[PDB]
């Protein structure tokens, strides 16, 4: 790593200097480092140039605005200070070059949208790995090779991607936030593919189209069941349209993939689909319509990238849910049980609507609300459980120091017929109540904890898992 080589595309004059690491933070800037002084969120990094110099950085790249011309080379205390205009916009490119262009050295798929980002990225990583890639994720649960996810400027993104390259990753699925995009945090990444899940409108779209036009998006895979998705597809004839609700318009002669029939059953969904790559049937072990959509998006993406349909089909049954996200537990001749982390009215409603599709009998909802937290959601979650489940079982969920029954009372207050709800304190006992009472064709949703393996009672983290409790009741292994 040399300053001269680093800057060669933009500043031919730049002096030769060996460089250690690249950092935006003068505090951690050590001997031999490249310190990058940027102007942004209520801070001017150029203020910290003396400090960085005192810590013995090898070189400095600084925002030129109001201080210098683009590519102007200065020297302070024998340390080169090189100025660049629009440094925030170019930081991704600068870091990309510094870290030897990690997105040019693995297959990077970006997923954007409100919902389904985590699941879609996870599916892309899992499926590609089943097909022989060494896959990784970068997203909300964290970063890492599949099974080793560790819980962010344009520099950090490039650095992390390089770390994954260094660990042998050949494929990375990355959740990309709207905020991330606008702040140029992925500006120089070479995306192999870009997936979209789901007056003023004109400016918003204009800003988004503009930003899109400046990125290397690769193959575009778009959910045509989303209204915004359809508008983007109208202007992108090379994009792949994905639908489970009749929104493929085949007059395009473009590329598409559509679920033709879905059977939502007690252990997943049987998805029949047609596509421009051919037709098939997938046995998904994921629950709900949204997860059909997410799965279809991942399938379309991998098809577009040239993974063979037959091999994708052969591996689809091995795709697993994100731990504690509509995670199904079944045992021969027992109720279906779904563990989901839903802990807000909106998420509970969604989880119940999803569960309902797979439920031939009665839908049970076992849930509670956290103590010593905002109380407002309690009656709303009560109303949702009452409306969208057949049996509401109200129990505890991290009561902390608050009187557990008081929390349950706030929940019941939100119901039209609180008397119809089953109340059982002791979360484990409430789960058991539902699981043991529910019939064979019933579905029990256990909401609020998902993957979490503790119950906070007082100030103690007691070892408790919904997943373990449910598994043991069904005679299976979590």
Short mmCIF file of C-alpha atoms in Angstrom, two decimals:
data_model
loop_
_atom_site.label_atom_id
_atom_site.label_comp_id
_atom_site.label_asym_id
_atom_site.label_seq_id
_atom_site.Cartn_x
_atom_site.Cartn_y
_atom_site.Cartn_z
CA UNK A 1 0.00 0.00 0.00
CA UNK A 2 1.54 3.25 -1.27
CA UNK A 3 0.11 6.78 -1.38
CA UNK A 4 1.37 7.27 -4.92
CA UNK A 5 -0.28 4.07 -6.24
CA UNK A 6 -3.43 4.72 -4.18
CA UNK A 7 -3.89 8.17 -5.74
CA UNK A 8 -2.63 7.37 -9.27
CA UNK A 9 -6.10 7.42 -10.96
CA UNK A 10 -6.81 10.96 -9.64
CA UNK A 11 -3.55 12.64 -8.52
CA UNK A 12 -0.54 11.72 -10.75
CA UNK A 13 1.80 14.04 -8.82
CA UNK A 14 1.36 12.30 -5.44
CA UNK A 15 4.50 11.42 -3.39
CA UNK A 16 5.60 7.83 -2.72
CA UNK A 17 4.91 6.80 0.89
CA UNK A 18 4.18 3.37 2.38
CA UNK A 19 0.81 3.22 4.16
CA UNK A 20 -0.38 1.00 7.00
CA UNK A 21 -4.17 1.35 7.54
CA UNK A 22 -6.77 3.88 6.41
CA UNK A 23 -8.86 5.65 9.07
CA UNK A 24 -11.33 8.56 9.46
CA UNK A 25 -10.68 8.75 13.24
CA UNK A 26 -7.60 10.73 14.36
CA UNK A 27 -7.89 9.08 17.80
CA UNK A 28 -6.93 5.60 16.53
CA UNK A 29 -4.60 6.91 13.78
CA UNK A 30 -1.22 5.22 14.42
CA UNK A 31 2.30 5.40 12.91
CA UNK A 32 2.32 4.83 9.13
CA UNK A 33 -1.48 5.26 8.78
CA UNK A 34 -3.40 7.19 6.16
CA UNK A 35 -5.70 9.63 7.94
CA UNK A 36 -8.67 10.83 5.91
CA UNK A 37 -10.06 14.20 6.98
CA UNK A 38 -13.68 14.57 5.82
CA UNK A 39 -16.40 17.21 6.40
CA UNK A 40 -19.88 15.98 7.31
CA UNK A 41 -22.08 15.27 10.33
CA UNK A 42 -21.45 18.41 12.44
CA UNK A 43 -17.66 17.74 12.26
CA UNK A 44 -14.62 18.82 10.22
CA UNK A 45 -11.92 16.12 10.27
CA UNK A 46 -9.38 18.71 9.02
CA UNK A 47 -9.38 20.12 12.59
CA UNK A 48 -7.70 16.87 13.66
CA UNK A 49 -4.85 17.06 11.10
CA UNK A 50 -2.30 18.32 13.72
CA UNK A 51 -3.31 15.54 16.17
CA UNK A 52 -3.00 12.89 13.41
CA UNK A 53 0.42 14.30 12.44
CA UNK A 54 1.55 14.20 16.11
CA UNK A 55 0.58 10.49 16.20
CA UNK A 56 2.89 9.92 13.20
CA UNK A 57 0.52 9.18 10.30
CA UNK A 58 2.42 8.63 7.01
CA UNK A 59 -0.04 10.74 4.99
CA UNK A 60 -3.30 12.69 4.99
CA UNK A 61 -6.08 13.02 2.44
CA UNK A 62 -8.36 16.01 3.14
CA UNK A 63 -11.54 17.68 1.89
CA UNK A 64 -10.46 20.52 -0.44
CA UNK A 65 -13.61 22.66 0.10
CA UNK A 66 -12.65 26.26 1.10
CA UNK A 67 -9.01 25.27 1.79
CA UNK A 68 -7.45 24.03 -1.48
CA UNK A 69 -7.90 22.92 -5.09
CA UNK A 70 -8.61 19.31 -6.14
CA UNK A 71 -5.42 17.23 -6.17
CA UNK A 72 -3.44 20.01 -4.46
CA UNK A 73 -0.44 18.47 -2.67
CA UNK A 74 0.86 20.12 0.50
CA UNK A 75 3.40 19.07 3.14
CA UNK A 76 3.18 19.65 6.93
CA UNK A 77 5.80 18.44 9.48
CA UNK A 78 7.19 16.36 6.57
CA UNK A 79 3.83 14.58 6.16
CA UNK A 80 2.08 14.92 2.76
CA UNK A 81 -1.44 16.38 2.93
CA UNK A 82 -3.35 15.83 -0.32
CA UNK A 83 -6.64 17.65 -0.95
CA UNK A 84 -9.60 16.20 -2.87
CA UNK A 85 -12.95 17.84 -3.72
CA UNK A 86 -16.17 15.91 -2.97
CA UNK A 87 -14.23 13.57 -0.66
CA UNK A 88 -17.44 12.17 0.88
CA UNK A 89 -18.66 11.12 -2.60
CA UNK A 90 -15.27 9.56 -3.50
CA UNK A 91 -14.40 7.91 -0.17
CA UNK A 92 -15.83 4.56 -1.26
CA UNK A 93 -13.67 4.60 -4.42
CA UNK A 94 -10.59 5.66 -2.42
CA UNK A 95 -11.08 2.90 0.16
CA UNK A 96 -11.91 0.39 -2.61
CA UNK A 97 -8.51 0.99 -4.20
CA UNK A 98 -6.76 0.96 -0.81
CA UNK A 99 -8.22 -2.47 0.00
CA UNK A 100 -7.56 -3.96 -3.47
CA UNK A 101 -11.15 -3.74 -4.78
CA UNK A 102 -12.78 -6.53 -2.70
CA UNK A 103 -16.11 -6.38 -4.63
CA UNK A 104 -14.14 -7.14 -7.84
CA UNK A 105 -12.83 -10.30 -6.06
CA UNK A 106 -16.11 -11.92 -4.92
CA UNK A 107 -19.71 -11.97 -6.17
CA UNK A 108 -21.47 -9.16 -4.24
CA UNK A 109 -25.25 -9.02 -4.20
CA UNK A 110 -26.95 -5.98 -2.70
CA UNK A 111 -30.49 -6.16 -1.27
CA UNK A 112 -32.54 -2.98 -0.65
CA UNK A 113 -36.11 -2.33 0.57
CA UNK A 114 -38.12 -1.91 3.78
CA UNK A 115 -38.66 -5.58 4.64
CA UNK A 116 -37.17 -8.93 3.69
CA UNK A 117 -33.57 -7.66 3.46
CA UNK A 118 -32.23 -9.91 6.19
CA UNK A 119 -34.08 -12.99 5.01
CA UNK A 120 -33.29 -12.40 1.34
CA UNK A 121 -29.54 -11.84 2.03
CA UNK A 122 -29.50 -14.95 4.22
CA UNK A 123 -31.18 -17.03 1.51
CA UNK A 124 -28.75 -15.71 -1.16
CA UNK A 125 -25.78 -16.61 1.07
CA UNK A 126 -27.14 -20.07 2.01
CA UNK A 127 -28.20 -21.04 -1.50
CA UNK A 128 -25.00 -19.88 -3.21
CA UNK A 129 -23.02 -21.83 -0.59
CA UNK A 130 -25.09 -24.98 -1.22
CA UNK A 131 -24.00 -24.53 -4.85
CA UNK A 132 -20.32 -24.47 -3.82
CA UNK A 133 -19.51 -20.81 -3.00
CA UNK A 134 -17.95 -19.78 0.29
CA UNK A 135 -20.63 -17.31 1.29
CA UNK A 136 -20.87 -14.37 3.64
CA UNK A 137 -23.38 -11.77 4.77
CA UNK A 138 -23.14 -8.11 5.64
CA UNK A 139 -26.26 -6.87 7.38
CA UNK A 140 -28.26 -6.06 10.49
CA UNK A 141 -27.50 -9.26 12.45
CA UNK A 142 -23.82 -8.47 11.63
CA UNK A 143 -20.96 -9.46 9.29
CA UNK A 144 -19.14 -12.66 8.43
CA UNK A 145 -18.84 -15.99 6.68
CA UNK A 146 -22.08 -17.97 6.97
CA UNK A 147 -22.38 -19.43 10.50
CA UNK A 148 -19.75 -16.98 11.82
CA UNK A 149 -21.56 -13.63 11.72
CA UNK A 150 -19.99 -11.06 14.10
CA UNK A 151 -22.58 -8.51 15.45
CA UNK A 152 -20.21 2.15 9.27
CA UNK A 153 -18.50 4.57 6.84
CA UNK A 154 -17.58 3.89 3.19
CA UNK A 155 -14.13 2.97 4.53
CA UNK A 156 -15.52 0.42 7.02
CA UNK A 157 -17.63 -1.22 4.27
CA UNK A 158 -14.62 -1.72 2.02
CA UNK A 159 -12.42 -2.85 4.94
CA UNK A 160 -15.03 -5.43 6.06
CA UNK A 161 -15.51 -6.71 2.49
CA UNK A 162 -11.71 -7.09 2.21
CA UNK A 163 -11.70 -9.03 5.50
CA UNK A 164 -14.27 -11.41 4.01
CA UNK A 165 -12.18 -11.75 0.82
CA UNK A 166 -9.17 -12.54 3.07
CA UNK A 167 -11.15 -15.28 4.84
CA UNK A 168 -11.90 -16.96 1.47
CA UNK A 169 -15.43 -15.65 0.80
CA UNK A 170 -16.41 -15.97 -2.89
CA UNK A 171 -19.96 -14.61 -2.45
CA UNK A 172 -21.37 -11.89 -0.21
CA UNK A 173 -24.98 -10.88 0.28
CA UNK A 174 -25.21 -7.35 1.65
CA UNK A 175 -28.18 -5.51 3.13
CA UNK A 176 -28.06 -1.97 1.76
CA UNK A 177 -30.03 0.74 3.62
CA UNK A 178 -31.53 3.77 1.89
CA UNK A 179 -29.49 5.92 4.33
CA UNK A 180 -26.33 3.99 3.37
CA UNK A 181 -26.96 4.67 -0.34
CA UNK A 182 -27.62 8.40 0.11
CA UNK A 183 -24.48 8.83 2.25
CA UNK A 184 -22.34 7.16 -0.47
CA UNK A 185 -21.37 4.24 1.77
CA UNK A 186 -21.49 1.77 -1.14
CA UNK A 187 -20.77 4.20 -3.98
CA UNK A 188 -17.78 2.31 -5.56
CA UNK A 189 -18.89 -1.27 -4.90
CA UNK A 190 -19.23 -3.49 -7.95
CA UNK A 191 -22.54 -5.22 -7.29
CA UNK A 192 -23.00 -8.40 -9.33
CA UNK A 193 -26.72 -7.99 -8.68
CA UNK A 194 -29.12 -5.62 -6.93
CA UNK A 195 -32.38 -6.87 -5.43
CA UNK A 196 -35.41 -4.73 -4.54
CA UNK A 197 -37.84 -6.35 -2.08
CA UNK A 198 -40.47 -3.62 -1.28
CA UNK A 199 -45.48 16.28 -5.79
CA UNK A 200 -43.04 14.74 -3.29
CA UNK A 201 -42.96 11.33 -5.02
CA UNK A 202 -41.34 12.95 -8.09
CA UNK A 203 -38.39 14.41 -6.13
CA UNK A 204 -37.89 11.20 -4.15
CA UNK A 205 -37.82 9.01 -7.26
CA UNK A 206 -35.65 11.56 -9.11
CA UNK A 207 -33.07 11.51 -6.30
CA UNK A 208 -33.18 7.67 -6.27
CA UNK A 209 -32.88 7.25 -10.06
CA UNK A 210 -29.95 9.68 -10.03
CA UNK A 211 -28.18 7.76 -7.25
CA UNK A 212 -28.92 4.48 -9.03
CA UNK A 213 -27.39 5.79 -12.28
CA UNK A 214 -24.13 6.53 -10.40
CA UNK A 215 -23.82 2.99 -8.93
CA UNK A 216 -22.59 -0.28 -10.46
CA UNK A 217 -25.80 -2.20 -9.76
CA UNK A 218 -25.19 -5.21 -12.01
CA UNK A 219 -28.26 -7.32 -12.68
CA UNK A 220 -31.45 -5.79 -11.27
CA UNK A 221 -33.95 -8.17 -9.68
CA UNK A 222 -37.20 -6.43 -8.72
CA UNK A 223 -40.35 -7.44 -6.90
CA UNK A 224 -43.16 -6.64 -9.35
CA UNK A 225 -45.76 -7.15 -6.60
CA UNK A 226 -44.62 -3.79 -5.19
CA UNK A 227 -46.08 -0.64 -6.79
CA UNK A 228 -42.67 1.10 -6.68
CA UNK A 229 -41.04 -2.05 -8.08
CA UNK A 230 -43.39 -1.93 -11.10
CA UNK A 231 -42.45 1.71 -11.82
CA UNK A 232 -38.73 0.85 -11.82
CA UNK A 233 -39.29 -2.24 -14.03
CA UNK A 234 -41.08 -0.03 -16.60
CA UNK A 235 -37.75 1.80 -17.21
CA UNK A 236 -35.37 -1.19 -16.85
CA UNK A 237 -35.93 -3.68 -19.73
CA UNK A 238 -32.89 -5.78 -18.68
CA UNK A 239 -34.19 -6.17 -15.06
CA UNK A 240 -35.74 -9.43 -13.85
CA UNK A 241 -39.40 -9.11 -12.78
CA UNK A 242 -40.46 -11.34 -9.84
CA UNK A 243 -44.10 -11.94 -8.82
CA UNK A 244 -46.33 -14.24 -6.77
CA UNK A 245 -49.47 -12.13 -7.54
CA UNK A 246 -49.95 -11.87 -11.34
CA UNK A 247 -47.84 -8.72 -11.98
CA UNK A 248 -45.49 -10.18 -14.60
CA UNK A 249 -46.32 -8.50 -17.91
CA UNK A 250 -44.89 -11.01 -20.45
CA UNK A 251 -45.28 -8.56 -23.42
CA UNK A 252 -41.85 -7.22 -22.26
CA UNK A 253 -40.08 -10.41 -23.50
CA UNK A 254 -37.76 -9.57 -20.61
CA UNK A 255 -36.73 -11.97 -17.90
CA UNK A 256 -39.25 -12.99 -15.24
CA UNK A 257 -40.13 -15.47 -12.53
CA UNK A 258 -43.58 -16.01 -11.08
CA UNK A 259 -45.16 -18.28 -8.51
CA UNK A 260 -48.15 -19.87 -10.29
CA UNK A 261 -49.45 -21.71 -7.18
CA UNK A 262 -48.47 -21.82 -3.52
CA UNK A 263 -49.71 -24.43 -1.06
CA UNK A 264 -49.15 -23.17 2.52
CA UNK A 265 -49.02 -26.32 4.67
CA UNK A 266 -48.07 -27.24 8.22
CA UNK A 267 -44.26 -27.31 7.69
CA UNK A 268 -43.66 -24.73 4.94
CA UNK A 269 -44.82 -23.87 1.43
CA UNK A 270 -44.87 -25.80 -1.81
CA UNK A 271 -44.17 -23.22 -4.50
CA UNK A 272 -44.88 -23.90 -8.17
CA UNK A 273 -43.28 -21.36 -10.49
CA UNK A 274 -42.61 -20.51 -14.13
CA UNK A 275 -39.67 -18.45 -15.37
CA UNK A 276 -37.69 -17.54 -18.47
CA UNK A 277 -35.12 -20.13 -17.24
CA UNK A 278 -37.80 -22.84 -17.00
CA UNK A 279 -40.32 -24.14 -14.51
CA UNK A 280 -40.22 -26.03 -11.24
CA UNK A 281 -41.49 -26.79 -7.81
CA UNK A 282 -39.72 -25.84 -4.57
CA UNK A 283 -40.40 -27.20 -1.09
CA UNK A 284 -39.68 -24.21 1.16
CA UNK A 285 -39.34 -24.67 4.90
CA UNK A 286 -40.09 -20.96 5.43
CA UNK A 287 -43.48 -19.62 6.53
CA UNK A 288 -45.81 -16.93 5.13
CA UNK A 289 -46.31 -15.14 1.78
CA UNK A 290 -43.56 -12.58 2.37
CA UNK A 291 -41.04 -15.43 2.63
CA UNK A 292 -42.30 -16.93 -0.64
CA UNK A 293 -41.53 -13.51 -2.18
CA UNK A 294 -38.08 -13.36 -0.53
CA UNK A 295 -37.27 -16.89 -1.69
CA UNK A 296 -38.40 -16.09 -5.26
CA UNK A 297 -36.22 -12.98 -5.29
CA UNK A 298 -33.18 -15.02 -4.21
CA UNK A 299 -33.98 -17.69 -6.85
CA UNK A 300 -34.36 -15.07 -9.66
CA UNK A 301 -31.10 -13.40 -8.57
CA UNK A 302 -29.09 -16.64 -8.65
CA UNK A 303 -30.66 -17.63 -12.00
CA UNK A 304 -29.73 -14.18 -13.43
CA UNK A 305 -26.14 -14.72 -12.18
CA UNK A 306 -26.05 -18.04 -14.08
CA UNK A 307 -26.47 -20.66 -11.36
CA UNK A 308 -28.23 -23.62 -13.08
CA UNK A 309 -31.95 -24.04 -12.33
CA UNK A 310 -31.67 -27.81 -11.72
CA UNK A 311 -28.97 -27.25 -9.08
CA UNK A 312 -30.95 -24.49 -7.36
CA UNK A 313 -34.00 -26.82 -7.26
CA UNK A 314 -31.87 -29.68 -5.86
CA UNK A 315 -30.74 -27.48 -2.93
CA UNK A 316 -33.88 -25.43 -2.14
CA UNK A 317 -35.14 -27.85 0.57
CA UNK A 318 -31.95 -27.19 2.57
CA UNK A 319 -32.67 -23.45 2.85
CA UNK A 320 -33.43 -22.60 6.47
CA UNK A 321 -35.20 -19.69 8.23
CA UNK A 322 -33.25 -17.03 10.06
CA UNK A 323 -33.14 -18.28 13.65
CA UNK A 324 -36.29 -17.16 15.49
CA UNK A 325 -37.86 -15.57 12.39
CA UNK A 326 -41.09 -17.42 11.58
CA UNK A 327 -39.12 -20.51 12.54
CA UNK A 328 -41.30 -23.61 12.25
CA UNK A 329 -41.13 -26.61 14.58
CA UNK A 330 -43.04 -29.74 13.68
CA UNK A 331 -43.24 -33.26 14.99
CA UNK A 332 -45.32 -36.16 13.60
CA UNK A 333 -48.91 -35.78 14.85
CA UNK A 334 -48.37 -32.55 16.88
CA UNK A 335 -49.52 -28.91 16.37
CA UNK A 336 -47.25 -26.79 14.20
CA UNK A 337 -45.33 -24.31 16.37
CA UNK A 338 -43.72 -21.12 14.99
CA UNK A 339 -41.22 -19.11 17.04
CA UNK A 340 -41.00 -15.47 15.91
CA UNK A 341 -39.34 -12.43 17.42
CA UNK A 342 -42.39 -10.19 16.72
CA UNK A 343 -42.56 -7.71 19.61
CA UNK A 344 -44.54 -4.75 18.19
CA UNK A 345 -48.21 -4.52 17.05
CA UNK A 346 -47.22 -4.37 13.35
CA UNK A 347 -44.79 -7.32 13.55
CA UNK A 348 -47.28 -9.43 15.57
CA UNK A 349 -50.05 -8.74 13.06
CA UNK A 350 -47.72 -9.79 10.21
CA UNK A 351 -46.52 -12.94 12.02
CA UNK A 352 -50.13 -14.00 12.79
CA UNK A 353 -51.31 -13.30 9.20
CA UNK A 354 -48.33 -15.38 7.95
CA UNK A 355 -49.06 -18.21 10.43
CA UNK A 356 -52.78 -18.19 9.52
CA UNK A 357 -51.95 -19.26 5.91
CA UNK A 358 -50.41 -22.52 7.19
CA UNK A 359 -53.19 -23.17 9.74
CA UNK A 360 -56.09 -25.54 8.97
CA UNK A 361 -57.30 -25.52 12.59
CA UNK A 362 -57.10 -22.82 15.25
CA UNK A 363 -54.31 -20.24 15.50
CA UNK A 364 -52.90 -19.75 19.03
CA UNK A 365 -50.74 -16.75 19.97
CA UNK A 366 -48.52 -16.95 23.06
CA UNK A 367 -46.98 -13.57 23.89
CA UNK A 368 -46.21 -10.96 26.52
CA UNK A 369 -44.60 -7.50 26.70
CA UNK A 370 -41.32 -6.33 28.22
CA UNK A 371 -41.44 -4.72 31.63
CA UNK A 372 -39.88 -1.33 32.54
CA UNK A 373 -40.21 -0.24 28.87
CA UNK A 374 -42.69 1.99 27.03
CA UNK A 375 -46.16 0.72 27.98
CA UNK A 376 -48.05 2.05 24.94
CA UNK A 377 -47.79 -1.01 22.72
CA UNK A 378 -49.34 -3.33 25.35
CA UNK A 379 -53.09 -2.78 24.66
CA UNK A 380 -52.33 -2.62 20.89
CA UNK A 381 -50.63 -6.04 20.95
CA UNK A 382 -53.60 -7.34 22.96
CA UNK A 383 -56.04 -6.09 20.31
CA UNK A 384 -53.91 -7.64 17.51
CA UNK A 385 -53.69 -11.05 19.24
CA UNK A 386 -57.46 -11.00 19.82
CA UNK A 387 -58.27 -10.02 16.21
CA UNK A 388 -55.78 -12.16 14.26
CA UNK A 389 -55.51 -15.26 16.49
CA UNK A 390 -58.30 -17.64 17.61
CA UNK A 391 -56.72 -18.17 21.05
CA UNK A 392 -54.64 -15.49 22.80
CA UNK A 393 -52.40 -16.85 25.57
CA UNK A 394 -51.04 -13.84 27.50
CA UNK A 395 -47.89 -14.53 29.48
CA UNK A 396 -44.60 -12.92 30.60
CA UNK A 397 -41.76 -11.64 28.40
CA UNK A 398 -38.77 -10.08 30.21
CA UNK A 399 -40.90 -8.50 33.00
CA UNK A 400 -37.67 -7.04 34.52
CA UNK A 401 -38.57 -5.26 37.81
CA UNK A 402 -42.20 -4.47 36.86
CA UNK A 403 -45.03 -6.44 38.45
CA UNK A 404 -45.67 -9.18 35.83
CA UNK A 405 -49.46 -9.20 36.30
CA UNK A 406 -49.57 -5.39 35.77
CA UNK A 407 -48.06 -5.86 32.31
CA UNK A 408 -50.60 -8.57 31.46
CA UNK A 409 -53.42 -6.28 32.70
CA UNK A 410 -52.26 -3.49 30.27
CA UNK A 411 -52.39 -6.05 27.43
CA UNK A 412 -55.89 -7.32 28.31
CA UNK A 413 -57.15 -3.69 28.62
CA UNK A 414 -56.69 -3.49 24.83
CA UNK A 415 -59.07 -6.38 24.10
CA UNK A 416 -62.80 -6.25 23.36
CA UNK A 417 -63.28 -9.53 25.26
CA UNK A 418 -60.39 -9.96 27.73
CA UNK A 419 -62.36 -12.78 29.35
CA UNK A 420 -61.84 -14.85 26.17
CA UNK A 421 -58.01 -14.63 26.50
CA UNK A 422 -56.09 -17.31 28.40
CA UNK A 423 -53.66 -15.85 30.91
CA UNK A 424 -50.81 -17.93 32.27
CA UNK A 425 -47.79 -16.62 34.08
CA UNK A 426 -44.60 -18.47 33.82
CA UNK A 427 -43.75 -18.16 30.13
CA UNK A 428 -42.58 -21.77 29.88
CA UNK A 429 -45.92 -22.92 31.42
CA UNK A 430 -47.92 -20.72 28.95
CA UNK A 431 -46.03 -22.12 25.98
CA UNK A 432 -46.67 -25.62 27.32
CA UNK A 433 -50.38 -24.78 27.81
CA UNK A 434 -50.76 -23.84 24.13
CA UNK A 435 -48.62 -26.62 22.70
CA UNK A 436 -50.26 -29.40 24.77
CA UNK A 437 -53.85 -28.13 24.31
CA UNK A 438 -53.63 -27.25 20.61
CA UNK A 439 -54.96 -29.88 18.15
CA UNK A 440 -52.93 -31.62 15.43
CA UNK A 441 -54.01 -29.21 12.69
CA UNK A 442 -53.60 -26.08 14.86
CA UNK A 443 -50.68 -23.64 14.70
CA UNK A 444 -49.20 -22.03 17.82
CA UNK A 445 -47.23 -18.78 17.28
CA UNK A 446 -44.83 -18.07 20.15
CA UNK A 447 -43.96 -14.39 19.73
CA UNK A 448 -41.57 -11.91 21.27
CA UNK A 449 -38.20 -13.56 21.75
CA UNK A 450 -37.23 -15.31 18.53
CA UNK A 451 -33.58 -16.41 18.89
CA UNK A 452 -33.14 -14.98 22.40
CA UNK A 453 -32.10 -17.48 25.08
CA UNK A 454 -32.91 -15.51 28.26
CA UNK A 455 -35.88 -14.28 30.30
CA UNK A 456 -35.12 -11.16 32.36
CA UNK A 457 -36.89 -11.60 35.74
CA UNK A 458 -35.93 -8.83 38.18
CA UNK A 459 -32.36 -7.97 37.17
CA UNK A 460 -31.41 -11.60 36.39
CA UNK A 461 -30.97 -13.21 32.98
CA UNK A 462 -32.46 -16.65 33.58
CA UNK A 463 -31.56 -19.21 30.92
CA UNK A 464 -34.75 -19.68 28.92
CA UNK A 465 -35.39 -20.28 25.23
CA UNK A 466 -38.77 -20.44 23.48
CA UNK A 467 -37.00 -22.57 20.85
CA UNK A 468 -35.68 -25.08 23.39
CA UNK A 469 -39.01 -25.21 25.28
CA UNK A 470 -40.95 -25.84 22.05
CA UNK A 471 -38.41 -28.41 20.73
CA UNK A 472 -38.52 -30.39 23.99
CA UNK A 473 -42.34 -30.37 24.05
CA UNK A 474 -42.50 -31.67 20.47
CA UNK A 475 -39.74 -34.26 21.10
CA UNK A 476 -37.46 -32.65 18.50
CA UNK A 477 -34.08 -30.85 18.67
CA UNK A 478 -33.98 -27.05 18.43
#
